[PDB]
């Protein structure tokens, strides 16, 4: 009997949700297509110090471009990632709408907010502006799907909340698709610094 969680991955079209979930190679080779709902469920195993956990990540087939997702998509979700694109302010402006839709169907499940595409130099949504998570008990991470930057962080935070073990760790990284773009180390360090300052500043 495997420990597994349904994770819904939501956010505006074009933010990188499919690119992000596909980084996990076994999750892609073992994905399941759900015809009735237009979903690809990716079974993502992570190996923790207490054993394996599986996040069954629900990736849309693009329907979020045209309207809200159907109830079946959200049903029995146990956690979520809301994604936006740090190069598009519109996608960050829609984050409260995604959070609203989640909480309406799923109440207080743990949610992580992810700002994707931080590999791109001309960044528009910077750390100082990313404040939605502060007021709602959400955890925030910068991510770059195309470079695997911070890939594991949303999943570790969720796993800790779901299991109720603040000391849970991943003993190894999952096998991920090789980076397609470089995440500049100086840029990452600067963005990491900017978030730390934003989180600590009075």
């Amino acid at each position: 009997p495997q420990v597994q969680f349904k994770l819904v991955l939501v956010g505006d079209g074009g933010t990188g949700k499919t690119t992000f979930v596909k980084r996990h190679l076994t999750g892609e080779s073992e994905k399941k297509y759900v015809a009735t709902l237009g979903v690809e469920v990716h079974p993502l195993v992570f190996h923790t110090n207490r054993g394996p956990i599986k996040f069954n990540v629900w990736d849309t087939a693009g329907q979020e471009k045209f309207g809200g997702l159907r109830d079946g998509y959200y049903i029995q979700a146990q956690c979520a990632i809301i994604m936006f694109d740090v190069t598009s302010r519109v996608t960050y402006k829609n984050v409260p709408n995604w959070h609203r839709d989640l909480v309406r169907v799923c109440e207080n499940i743990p949610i992580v907010l992810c700002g994707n595409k931080v590999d791109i130099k001309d960044r528009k949504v910077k750390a100082k502006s990313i404040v939605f998570h502060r007021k709602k008990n959400l955890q925030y991470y910068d991510i770059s799907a195309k470079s695997n930057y911070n890939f594991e962080k949303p999943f570790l935070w969720l796993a800790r909340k779901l299991i109720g073990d603040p000391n849970l760790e991943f003993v190894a990284m999952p096998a991920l698709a090789p980076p397609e773009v470089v995440m500049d180390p100086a840029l990452a360090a600067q963005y990491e610094h900017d978030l730390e300052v934003a989180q600590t500043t009075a």
């Binding site: 009997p1 420990v3 597994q4 349904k6 399941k32 759900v34 009735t36 709902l37 979903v39 469920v41 079974p43 923790t48 207490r50 054993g51 956990i53 069954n56 079946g72 998509y73 049903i75 029995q76 299991i163």
Partner: protein, 36 residues
């Protein structure tokens, strides 16, 4: 460890979308597929 993990008695995993369903359910609560 996770040695103390167990699923509810009679619960079953949907073979189409992987959602865990109740023992008395005949169809998946999410995707409506029949119980395997």
């Amino acid at each position: 460890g996770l040695d103390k993990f167990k699923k509810p008695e009679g619960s079953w995993d949907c073979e189409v979308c992987l959602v865990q369903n109740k023992a008395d359910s005949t169809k998946c609560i999410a995707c409506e597929s029949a119980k395997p």
